Design a protein around this ligand. Structure first.
Ligand SMILES: C=C(C)COc1ccc([C@H]2C3=C(CC(C)(C)CS3(=O)=O)Nc3c(O)cccc3N2C(=O)c2nc(C)oc2C)c(F)c1
Ligand SMILES: [Cl-]
Length: 564
């Protein structure tokens, strides 16, 4: 077999009470009135997810697969990776990262407390000495906020997360942080998605599209990607890692983590009960983003060859895959894509939805997002990435009513700043509240490509200029399709219409402007859309001075990474 999971019967348990309903709160109600449509997942649906992620995997490798692997290993051979010190590794730990079972937590780790450091050291020596004993993991149900989808069904079950102890996570950083931050670009080149800011990603897609004589593209969605990852896949990943120049201890640690953690191991619930056994990818280890990306790139590159797709360019982020190629015609494209899917299926990665050939770039969705067009102040066409705002808006409402450790609304503003909905709704709403509570200068945690950053709202204009360009503050004449998707979403969720948001923004803009300093800059740049008599926007001096060096280098979702 090789089942992805085996289960004992013990339940996946919560470690505290779980909220599932949006509260009825004046602050969140002014953004979204249909509160009954907004829910959070809980452990109560864990068994539904367990059923979905548990299955037998079929895998047959072939010459195309072996050829692509060799090519990838030859590129990995150019990489030299360094060991992180205990200090560097500790400072990469998020302050609210899950505590250890052995008497210390994240703050102790970041503070280099002797008890934390001593344990981290014992854990490391154990990786150097013990090459085989499976390492324990905890399994938990993830709490996440969605809007009800009565067409698709009703409610999504919780996702499951599997992660080792805090001490092990620190050791993973020491051995592999530099590998996972450098190796994927060296191997995959321009295909590695996490190297691109938002404006660079949209440029890559558009330039790629325009580079073909007659372009065709598709996204490919693998069903339960993490559970399709076999022990063989994980050993192949390691074989690529082992091509880097490594310190001896790093090389041994990688070999031991592979065997003891990454290929599988025991699952324990929050009550300490043996829950089952994993033989697939764990969502909460440092190598999940990097390994999923390599794995998906290897399988898809090899499947493109089998399918005989012509002049393919791929963009890969973890399990998210988009391919743009030269059309051979309607029927031959449909056939070629069916061959592609069969080859992926043999490699263990069958599709959820069958892929569909697309002949318009705007109709491809990758990393939740699609290309759209607007115009800048001078009328020039500007391309940007957008997405359906339903989930962002639901989450923003939840985050307004409940203090959460990570603010998705802030990540959405940063990453979707040129969109009609991020500008008119998210910026207006959150700047209104922060202004009212006098908290514009207080730093808030968000995630960018899975890593956690602490950001001041007042630094948004500079950050946005860097990620999107100055046109982010001047876009208008959005496409009718985009406008209509947003407006219909607002009606669905009971969010006031865009006309109301314009009225609210004029008032926030005025108050920001009144305060001078960085608030005035926010007023001037973030809300220029809200006035007829517009201000001429020049480049922001602080923008060129920003250190964004580590922002768009690699993906770290599930990897417990905090960047200062
Ligand atoms: C630049 C663009 C505009 C388009 O491309 C993007 C856009 C966003 C991300 C980040 C992010 C998100 C939420 C944000 C914005 C709120 C924060 S984010 O930047 O981390 N979502 C998504 C998705 O919705 C879908 C895929 C991946 C991620 N992302 C992850 O990293 C990630 N990986 C896993 C396993 O789960 C998650 C959530 C990305 F990687 C690429
Ligand atoms: Cl092989």
């Amino acid at each position: 077999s090789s089942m992805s999971y085996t289960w004992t019967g013990a339940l996946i348990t919560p470690c505290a009470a779980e909220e599932s309903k949006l509260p009825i709160n004046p602050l969140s109600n002014s953004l979204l009135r249909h509160h009954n449509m907004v829910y959070a997942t809980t452990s109560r649906s864990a068994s539904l997810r367990q059923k979905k992620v548990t299955f037998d995997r079929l895998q047959v490798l072939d010459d195309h697969y072996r050829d692509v692997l060799k090519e990838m290993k030859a590129k990995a051979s150019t990489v030299k990776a360094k060991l992180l010190s205990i200090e560097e590794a500790c400072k990469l730990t998020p302050p609210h990262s899950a505590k250890s079972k052995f008497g210390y937590g994240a703050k102790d780790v970041r503070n280099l407390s002797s008890r934390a450091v001593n344990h981290i050291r014992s854990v490391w020596e154990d990786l150097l000495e013990d090459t085989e004993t499976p390492i324990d993991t905890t399994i938990m149900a993830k709490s996440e906020v969605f809007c009800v989808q009565p067409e698709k069904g009703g409610r999504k079950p919780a996702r499951l997360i599997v992660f080792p102890d805090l001490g092990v996570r620190v050791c993973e950083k020491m051995a592999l942080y530099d590998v996972v931050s450098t190796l994927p670009q060296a191997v995959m080149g321009s295909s590695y998605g996490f190297q691109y800011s938002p404006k660079q990603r949209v440029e890559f897609l558009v330039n790629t599209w325009k580079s073909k004589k007659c372009p065709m593209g598709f996204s490919y969605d693998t069903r339960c990607f993490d559970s399709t990852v076999t022990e063989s896949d994980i050993r192949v990943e390691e074989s690529i890692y082992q091509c880097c120049d490594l310190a001896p201890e790093a090389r041994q640690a990688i070999r031991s983590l592979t065997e003891r953690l990454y290929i599988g191991g025991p699952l324990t619930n929050s009550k300490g009960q043996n829950c089952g056994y994993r033989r697939c990818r764990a969502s909460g280890v440092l190598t999940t983003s990097c390994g999923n990306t390599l794995t998906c790139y290897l399988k898809a590159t090899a499947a493109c060859r089998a399918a005989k797709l012509q002049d393919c360019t791929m963009l890969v982020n973890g399990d998210d895959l988009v391919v743009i190629c030269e059309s051979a015609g309607t029927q031959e494209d449909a056939a070629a894509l069916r061959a592609f899917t069969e080859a992926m299926t043999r490699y263990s990665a069958p599709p959820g939805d069958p892929p569909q050939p697309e002949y318009d770039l705007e109709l491809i969705t990758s990393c939740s997002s699609n290309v759209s067009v607007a115009h800048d102040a001078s009328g020039k066409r500007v391309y940007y990435l957008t997405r359906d705002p339903t989930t962002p808006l639901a989450r923003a409402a939840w985050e307004t009513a409940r203090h959460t450790p990570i603010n998705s609304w802030l990540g959405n503003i940063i990453m979707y700043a040129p969109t009609l909905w991020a500008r008119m709704i998210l910026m207006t709403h959150f700047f209104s509240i922060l202004l009212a509570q006098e908290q514009l200068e207080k730093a808030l945690d968000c995630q960018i490509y899975g890593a956690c950053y602490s950001i001041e709202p007042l630094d948004l204009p500079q950050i946005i200029e860097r990620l999107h360009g100055l046109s982010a503050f001047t876009l208008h004449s959005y496409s009718p399709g985009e406008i209509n998707r947003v407006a219909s979403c607002l009606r669905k969720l009971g969010v006031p219409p865009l006309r109301t948001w314009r009225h609210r923004a004029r008032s926030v803009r005025a108050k920001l402007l009144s305060q001078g300093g960085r608030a005035a800059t926010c007023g001037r740049y973030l809300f220029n859309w809200a006035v007829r008599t517009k201000l001429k926007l020049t480049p922001i001096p602080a923008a060129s001075q920003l250190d964004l060096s580590g922002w768009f280098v690699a993906g770290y979702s599930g990897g417990d990474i905090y960047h200062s």
